[PDB]
């Protein structure tokens, strides 16, 4: 059994901070701790900070996302 | 008088990077960063783990406001 496509285009971020029309965060690495761990998921409660949301999404889905880690060396 | 906007959906983010890696994760060393570093949080980068501007295509055809993270020297 085979099947065709069309456009359907679903969003990333469902919904955080939708009234921004692009969402950036920047941040000064001088002012991060010893360690700092970003959602690349969009689906974090302290978004853009990971909370392990990522977990049940790749489950769901069969996603692989994960966070980024800015760390000092060390 | 009332009214929802739904956007939930169970689509996988990344379409297609890096998918023999069961969940992708990057680590760096601050003090290996030069001025400015650019993070994807698309999914749809070409030079993942960083920003390629392919979230402005994404964020055009989805209606997706989704972007970058950055990392930097204090000014
Ligand atoms: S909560 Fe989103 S990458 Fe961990
Ligand atoms: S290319 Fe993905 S956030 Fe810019």
Avoid at 35 to 62: I, L, M, Q
Wanted: glycine share 6%; aromatic share 10%; hydrophobic share 30%.
């Amino acid at each position: 059994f085979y099947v065709k496509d069309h456009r359907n285009k679903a969003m990333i971020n469902l919904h955080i901070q939708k009234d921004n029309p692009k969402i950036v965060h920047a941040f000064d690495m001088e002012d991060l701790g010893d360690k700092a761990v970003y959602c690349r998921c969009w689906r974090s409660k302290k978004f853009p900070f990971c909370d392990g949301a990522c977990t049940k999404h790749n489950e769901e889905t069969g996603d692989n996302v994960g966070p980024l880690i800015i760390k000092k060396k060390e």
